[PDB]
């Protein structure tokens, strides 16, 4: 149930709300976004539903919808339109206005719709368009750009402004704002580009009363219009009901079925028309018409029934506009960092109190804990990392309007694949022709054009009812595919060879839905007599041939072909004793030519795998990523595609699970059907999955773990399957191209859309090519992005702790680092490094091992502690080595910083730490397995080299920036070379530590604490099934 609350508005109250939400703070905007009821109570006063300009909809979950007007008030909730009915005082959806009208009403609507009625119904129903509104820059900002670390950055900016660091807070604010605005611009431009490649309209012909017609746009279509369908077919603009002629539709975009569907004219009657009862007669929006043929009249008419979001495709894409729910692994890491930073802050407060500095300085340093935990350039570094990942994906043709979900691509353990249009082509392609030699079959010939010039070749070429329209063959889709395969050229009719004799059709018997076959009579120069061909259903066509021409294994071979989802159509022929002339061959009755045939062969049609599918599936199976086929097609085609695709290896068992509906007196039962030709896969249909979910809730986890083929699977069942897999703690990806996959793509963690319609403009990922090559690309980019994010976080931690240790060592001496030294270290070094280190691309190939999913790892913490030990050792060694020199004179301990600068202690500590900030940057930037080698990042190499050169110039060149940076000029060149030597030892030690840890720590962890269990539910289920398989 839902409740609609009305809220009118007043100008003074609106301006008051605006000023109190803008001039006061930005916090009220986010608070109102968290709870819209407070915002609507503050801005809008309660009113009556008949006078409301606003509705609050809870279904509780609260949505605020404005009440638009066209004296026709309405509102749009998740796409659906709810007009305000003025006689019953409610907002009734427009979907309910055509309810109850019968088939006679639909047939009376075949004379078009008058213009005045057209405008009335366009006001009522709106445009015939599935339009998803663009997210504005504020909403895009909140959902994408902001991070919880920007709150820390805002607090630190407030702290800086409190302690009067204007040229530092301003620079940090500029960097963060530029990163945020550039990311918003990139995401907005990608969304606009996605929505510019979707064609929301066509030029459709509509009947108009009075015998006239008019070519209107596809958006002017309203329920009641009578479309005139073109004979060449094309995409369907809306949901209609055939009232004249019949169509041949390819509904693979809505249902996933690859076999073309024959839609027939709606039958006249008093019963109410229903899109489910009369689905055999309805044309659905988004489906492709392959052939529109009319018996009576010169046009194929289809009365429009639903337009816009009330269509089937509109209903499918409307269910994903419902809002439903990345940093939790990093907040634990920053809390672990905060423990160390708090210990250091306690030490700093104690050692500053011993120095008797003002208490305000002490409390400012205490509050500096937040800046220590979250560095100033951490949010900017993360935003730039996501920007680099998004740009790298876009340069490959993949649109990512949710850059925060790129890291989820590196966590994927399972990928669900649609079959029709994603793994295979949309329709049926010619598998081959099976000739006959003597009395028995011959091996299948994949290319019928390679056949000799015999009866079978001419039967494949000429036995059809094709026509020429705009220099292209127009007719039955299977006939089109057969003639394309045979290579012959269409020009009663004449056919020229692909490069023999051009045979000419002398007569043609039309294809009938009762006889399930068609016949032609052809002749060619140099022949003794005409030759009549027959093409149709193999079972009944073979019933016309001679018993000595049909092989004894005909039924077995037909069963073998039709058990794999193939569309077999038989061909037959017979020499005709008729004279080769049109005076007699045009008067031949069908019954004489249909009898005493000779089976020439079979023509196998199959749903063809795309060439880019098998390598990708084998690649995913090599890296131990589960491949699951989630299709709306039948079980035989799905199983055949899985077996020939790589999801099921030829040596791996496949089990069909068949759930029986519980009838009266019996309960639901599961029976498993093992077939011939993870080593144990499960195949099951949609109804079987639905019965297993509700009647066998304990066996559902085992089905989900072992199942690999899910056929006849409804869109709601697809998204339910994705959700159930995610309940097993899977990270489920999904690749789809149809409207049936929208719910699965939205519910999945990484949903890549191959669609060219409005389903793509709201998907996280959208590939520009119609293959699944994007899936390995997305996974590689996700692994690279996860590795880069972990490297950035580790570098920020190492930086913060290095600077904190340096500052503590200086505080113990009653010294500080220095304002301009702080500015150099942060802005010039760490901001540059964090920006340019996120630029390294993904590795060329996928790997078996995934990147770690948590920042609190024994490897990560151990590496951080060892690098900190090395850094602290180097800095303290430099300090205690400066303290043992003849030229060294101690600082003036009486005065405090920054007045005791320049001195030797600060100079040495800054000299060592500045090199450490680059060493710890080159160290955490790891390449393989998940990233390219470091040296491929030319900007980052150049930045590191230039900064190292600058720091070596500071160390060695006498008088270079020793004044600005408040450094002290050292005259002992031996000490300068010894400091450089300490820097080199730190460099080699950091790299050796990283290599030794990365190569020997997992082995040490395995040997010390043997992890004999896992917490992921699917892994425990896999262990349990390995110990005891569920189907014995
Ligand atoms: C207050 C005064 C006296 C101090 C001046 C300090 C500047 C030298 C700092 C401030 C911000 C720093 C910048 C911070 C960010 C970057 C990003 C980086 O450029 C890119 O990000 C391009 C990325 C690509 O190659 O695609 C180059 C270094 C740079 C400009 C830094 C160069 C040094 C800058 C200009
Ligand atoms: F397009 Be899929 F087979 F649902
Ligand atoms: Mg599809």
**How many C-beta neighbours within 10 Å does residue 698 have?**
6
CA dihedral sign, ordered 961, 966, 972, 974: negative
**How many C-beta neighbours within 10 Å does residue 382 have?**
24
As a whole number of angstroms, the distance between CA 263 and CA 267 comes to 12
Q: Is the CB of 418 under 6 A from ligand 2?
A: yes
**How many C-beta neighbours within 10 Å does residue 674 have?**
9
DSSP for residue 992: H
The pocket around ligand 1, CB under 6 angstroms, is made up of 167, 171, 823, 827-828, 831-832, 835, 939
Coil, strand or helix at 630: strand
As a whole number of angstroms, the distance between CA 330 and CA 789 comes to 10
Classify domain 424-609 at the CATH class level.
Answer: alpha beta
The closest-lying atom of ligand 2 relative to the alpha carbon of residue 713 is 4
- How remote is the CA of residue 255 from the centroid of ligand 3, in Å? 8
- How remote is the CA of residue 682 from the centroid of ligand 2, in Å? 18
Q: Which ligand is nearest to the CA of 419?
A: 2
Q: Going by CA atoms, what residue is nearest to atom 34 of ligand 1?
A: 828
445-480 b/e (C-beta count within 10 Å ≥ 16 → b): beebbebeeebbbbbbbbbbbbeeeeeeebbbbbbb
As a whole number of angstroms, the distance between CA 759 and CA 737 comes to 8
**How many C-beta neighbours within 10 Å does residue 220 have?**
17
How far CA 220 is from CA of 98, 113, 125, 454, in Å, comes to: 18, 12, 10, 53
- How remote is the CA of residue 420 from the centroid of ligand 3, in Å? 4
- Phi, psi (5° rounding) for residue 16? -65, -45
Residue 1008: Cβ-neighbour burial (10 angstroms; 0-12, 13-18, 19+): exposed
Token pair of 368 as six digits: 């500096």
As a whole number of angstroms, the distance between CA 175 and CA 633 comes to 52
As a whole number of angstroms, the distance between CA 689 and CA 658 comes to 9
Q: What share of the chain is helix, strand, coil (3-state, %, to 5)?
A: 45, 20, 35
CA gyration radius for the chain?
Answer: 37
- Give which of 948, 883, 882 is closest to 916, Cα–Cα: 948
**Ligand 2 pocket mutation, candidates 313, 418, 647, 712, criterion most atoms within 8 A of CB:** 418
Q: How far is CA 179 from the centre of its chain?
A: 25
**How many C-beta neighbours within 10 Å does residue 953 have?**
11
- How remote is the CA of residue 630 from the centroid of ligand 3, in Å? 10
- Resolution (Å) of this entry: 2.8
**Ligand 1 pocket mutation, candidates 390, 827, 939, criterion most atoms within 8 A of CB:** 827
**CATH T-level fold of 203-318:** 2.70.150
- How remote is the CA of residue 631 from the centroid of ligand 3, in Å? 8
- Give which of 29, 7, 8, 34 is closest to 18, Cα–Cα: 29
Q: Is the CB of 637 under 6 A from ligand 2?
A: no
CA dihedral sign, ordered 859, 862, 868, 870: negative
The closest-lying atom of ligand 2 relative to the alpha carbon of residue 632 is 4
The closest-lying atom of ligand 2 relative to the alpha carbon of residue 737 is 1
- Given a contact cutoff of 8 angstroms between Cβ atoms, the answer to whether 255 and 740 are in contact is yes
749 in a labelled binding site: no
Cα-Cα end-to-end distance for the chain = 46
Q: Going by CA atoms, what residue is nearest to atom 30 of ligand 1?
A: 832
- Given a contact cutoff of 8 angstroms between Cβ atoms, the answer to whether 965 and 907 are in contact is no
Q: Is the CB of 738 under 6 A from ligand 2?
A: yes
Coil, strand or helix at 441: strand
Beta-bridge partner residues of 73 = 69
Return the domain boundaries, the chain: 1-97, 203-318, 328-397+779-1008, 408-423+611-768, 424-609
Pairing of strands 68-69, 54-58: unpaired
Q: Which ligand is nearest to the CA of 939?
A: 1
Domains 408-423+611-768 and 424-609 share a fold: no
Residues whose CB falls within 8 Å of the CB of residue 361, separated by 6 or more in sequence, listed in order? 352
Pairing of strands 73-77, 80-85: antiparallel
DSSP class per residue in 297-363: SSSEEEEEEE-GGGSHHHHHHHTTSS-----HHHHHHHHHHHHHHHHHHHHHHHHHHHTT--HHHHH
State the maximum Cα–Cα separation within the chain, in Å, rounded to a whole number. Answer: 126
Tell me which of 225, 239, 368, 418 is the catalytic residue.
Answer: 418
Deposited experimental method: cryo-EM
818 phi-psi bin (left φ>0, alpha ψ -120 to 50, beta other): left
DSSP for residue 451: S
Q: Which ligand is nearest to the CA of 418?
A: 2
- Phi, psi (5° rounding) for residue 219? -85, -15
The closest-lying atom of ligand 2 relative to the alpha carbon of residue 419 is 3
The closest-lying atom of ligand 2 relative to the alpha carbon of residue 421 is 1
Token pair of 829 as six digits: 């070094």
- Give which of 510, 470, 472 is closest to 492, Cα–Cα: 510
- Given a contact cutoff of 8 angstroms between Cβ atoms, the answer to whether 927 and 840 are in contact is yes
**Ligand 1 pocket mutation, candidates 389, 828, 939, 944, criterion most atoms within 8 A of CB:** 828
Q: Is the CB of 420 under 6 A from ligand 2?
A: yes
Q: Is the CB of 419 under 6 A from ligand 2?
A: yes
As a whole number of angstroms, the distance between CA 114 and CA 212 comes to 11
The owner of tokens 């030490």 is 347
As a whole number of angstroms, the distance between CA 888 and CA 880 comes to 11
Beta strand residue intervals within 620-689, DSSP E: 626-630, 653-660, 669-674, 680-684
The closest-lying atom of ligand 1 relative to the alpha carbon of residue 939 is 25
Q: Which ligand is nearest to the CA of 829?
A: 1
As a whole number of angstroms, the distance between CA 808 and CA 946 comes to 28
- Given a contact cutoff of 8 angstroms between Cβ atoms, the answer to whether 43 and 14 are in contact is yes
- How remote is the CA of residue 831 from the centroid of ligand 1, in Å? 7
- How remote is the CA of residue 833 from the centroid of ligand 1, in Å? 10
Residues whose CB falls within 8 Å of the CB of residue 957, separated by 6 or more in sequence, listed in order? none
- Phi, psi (5° rounding) for residue 624? 60, 45
The CATH superfamily assigned to 408-423+611-768 is HAD superfamily/HAD-like (3.40.50.1000)
The CATH superfamily assigned to 328-397+779-1008 is Calcium-transporting ATPase, transmembrane domain (1.20.1110.10)
737 in a labelled binding site: yes
Three-state SS sequence of 463-511 = CCCCEEECCEEECCHHHHHHHHHHCCEECCEEEECCCCCCEEEEEEEEE
- How remote is the CA of residue 321 from the centroid of ligand 3, in Å? 20
Residue 910: Cβ-neighbour burial (10 angstroms; 0-12, 13-18, 19+): buried
The owner of tokens 């012909």 is 205
**Any catalytic annotation for residue 217?**
no
Q: Is the CB of 253 under 6 A from ligand 2?
A: no
**Ligand 2 pocket mutation, candidates 252, 428, 628, 751, criterion most atoms within 8 A of CB:** 252
- What element of type H or E holds 205? strand 203-208
As a whole number of angstroms, the distance between CA 230 and CA 332 comes to 62
């Amino acid at each position: 149930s839902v409740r609609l609350s009305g809220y009118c508005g007043s100008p003074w109250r609106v301006i008051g709300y605006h000023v109190v939400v803008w001039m006061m703070a930005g916090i009220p905007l986010l608070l109102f976004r968290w709870k819209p009821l407070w915002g609507v109570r503050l801005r809008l006063r309660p009113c009556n539903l008949a006078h409301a300009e606003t509705l609050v909809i809870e279904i509780w979950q609260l949505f605020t919808v404005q009440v638009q007007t066209e004296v026709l008030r309405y509102y749009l909730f998740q796409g659906q339109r709810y007009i305000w009915i003025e006689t019953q005082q409610a907002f009734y959806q427009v979907s309910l206005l055509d309810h109850g009208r019968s088939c006679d009403d639909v047939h009376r609507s075949r004379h078009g719709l008058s213009l005045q009625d057209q405008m009335v119904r366009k006001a009522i129903y709106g445009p015939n368009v599935i339009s998803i509104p663009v997210k504005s820059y504020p909403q895009l900002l909140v959902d994408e750009a902001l991070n919880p670390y920007y709150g820390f950055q805002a607090f630190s900016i407030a702290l800086w402004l409190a302690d009067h660091y204007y040229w530092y807070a301003l620079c940090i604010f500029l960097i963060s704002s530029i990163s945020i605005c550039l990311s918003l611009y990139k995401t907005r431009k990608q969304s606009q580009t996605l929505r510019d490649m979707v064609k929301l309209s066509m030029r459709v012909c509509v009947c108009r009363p009075g015998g006239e017609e008019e070519w209107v746009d596809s958006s002017e279509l309203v329920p009641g219009d009578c479309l005139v369908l073109p004979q060449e077919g094309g995409l369907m603009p809306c949901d209609a009901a055939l009232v004249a002629g019949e169509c041949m539709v390819n509904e693979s975009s809505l249902t996933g079925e690859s076999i073309p569907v024959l839609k027939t004219a709606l039958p006249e009657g008093l019963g109410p028309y229903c899109a489910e009862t009369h689905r055999r007669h309805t044309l659905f929006c988004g489906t492709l018409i392959l052939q529109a043929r009319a018996y009576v009249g010169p046009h194929v008419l289809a009365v429009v029934t639903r337009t816009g979001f009330c269509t089937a495709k509109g209903g499918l894409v409307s269910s994903i506009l419902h809002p439903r729910p990345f940093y939790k692994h990093s907040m634990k890491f920053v809390a672990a960092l905060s423990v160390l930073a708090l210990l250091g802050t306690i030490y700093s407060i104690f050692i500053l109190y011993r120095n008797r500095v003002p208490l305000n300085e002490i409390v400012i340093r205490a509050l500096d804990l937040v800046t220590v935990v979250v560095p100033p350039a951490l949010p900017a570094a993360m935003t730039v990392c996501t920007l680099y990942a998004q740009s790298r994906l876009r340069r490959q043709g993949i649109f990512c309007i949710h850059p925060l979900r790129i890291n989820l691509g590196g966590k994927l353990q399972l990928v669900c694949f649609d079959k029709t249009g994603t793994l295979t082509e949309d329709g049926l392609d010619v598998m081959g022709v099976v000739p006959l030699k003597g009395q028995a079959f011959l091996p299948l010939v994949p290319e019928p054009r390679r056949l000799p010039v015999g009866p079978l070749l001419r039967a494949l070429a000429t036995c059809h009812a094709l026509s020429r329209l705009q220099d292209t063959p127009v007719g039955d889709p299977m006939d089109l595919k057969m003639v394309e395969s045979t290579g012959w050229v269409l020009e009663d009719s004449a056919f020229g060879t692909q490069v023999p004799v051009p045979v000419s059709v002398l007569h043609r018997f039309p294809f009938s839905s009762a006889l399930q076959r068609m016949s032609v009579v052809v002749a060619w120069p140099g022949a003794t007599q005409p030759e009549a061909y027959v093409k149709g259903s193999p079972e009944l066509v073979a019933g016309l041939c001679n018993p000595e021409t049909v092989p004894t294994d005909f039924a077995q071979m037909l069963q073998s072909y039709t058990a794999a989802g193939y569309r077999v159509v038989a061909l037959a022929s017979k020499p005709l004793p008729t004279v080769p002339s049109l005076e007699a061959a045009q008067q031949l009755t069908r019954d004489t030519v249909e009898g005493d045939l000779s089976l020439l062969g079979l023509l196998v049609m199959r749903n063809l795998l795309k060439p880019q599918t098998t390598p990708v599936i084998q690649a995913l199976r090599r890296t131990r990523i589960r491949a699951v086929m989630v299709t709306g097609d039948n079980l035989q085609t799905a199983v055949t595609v899985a077996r020939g695709c790589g999801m099921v290896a030829p040596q791996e068992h496949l089990i069909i699970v068949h759930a029986t509906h519980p009838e009266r007196g019996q309960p639901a039962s599961l029976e498993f059907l093992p077939m011939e030709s993870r080593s144990r896969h499960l195949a099951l249909s949609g109804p079987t999955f639905g019965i297993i979910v509700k009647h066998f809730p304990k066996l559902l986890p085992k089905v989900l773990v072992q199942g690999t083929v899910f056929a006849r699977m409804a869109p709601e069942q697809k998204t339910e399957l994705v959700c159930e897999l995610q309940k097993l703690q899977y990270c489920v990806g999904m690749c789809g191209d149809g409207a049936n996959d929208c719910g699965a793509l939205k519910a999945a963690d990484v949903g890549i859309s191959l669609s060219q319609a409005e389903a793509s403009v709201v998907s996280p990922f959208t590939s520009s090519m119609a293959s699944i090559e994007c899936v390995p690309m997305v996974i590689r980019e996700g692994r690279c992005s996860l590795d880069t994010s972990f490297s950035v976080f580790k570098y920020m931690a190492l930086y913060s702790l290095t600077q904190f240790i340096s500052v503590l060592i200086l505080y113990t001496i009653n010294t500080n680092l220095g304002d301009l030294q702080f500015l150099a270290i942060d802005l010039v070094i760490t901001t540059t490094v964090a920006v340019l280190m996120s630029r390294t691309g993904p590795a060329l190939v996928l790997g078996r091992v995934r990147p770690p999913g948590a920042l609190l790892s024994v490897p990560v913490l151990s590496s951080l502690l060892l690098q900190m030990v090395l850094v602290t050792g180097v800095q303290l060694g430099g300090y205690f080595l400066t303290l043992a020199q003849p030229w060294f004179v101690p600082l003036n301990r009486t005065v405090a910083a920054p007045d005791n600068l320049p001195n030797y202690e600060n100079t040495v500590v800054f000299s060592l730490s500045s090199f450490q900030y680059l060493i710890l940057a080159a160290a955490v930037s790891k390449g393989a397995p998940f990233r390219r080698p470091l040296y491929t990042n030319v900007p980052f190499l150049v930045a590191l080299a230039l900064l190292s050169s600058v720091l070596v110039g500071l160390v060695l060149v006498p008088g270079l920036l020793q004044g600005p940076l408040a450094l002290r000029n050292i005259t002992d060149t031996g000490f300068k070379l010894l400091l450089l030597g300490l820097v080199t030892l730190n460099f080699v030690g950091a790299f050796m530590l990283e290599s030794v840890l990365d190569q020997c720590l997992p082995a040490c962890l395995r040997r010390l604490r043997p992890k004999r269990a896992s917490k992921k539910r699917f892994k425990q289920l896999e262990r349990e099934l390995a110990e005891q398989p569920w189907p014995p």
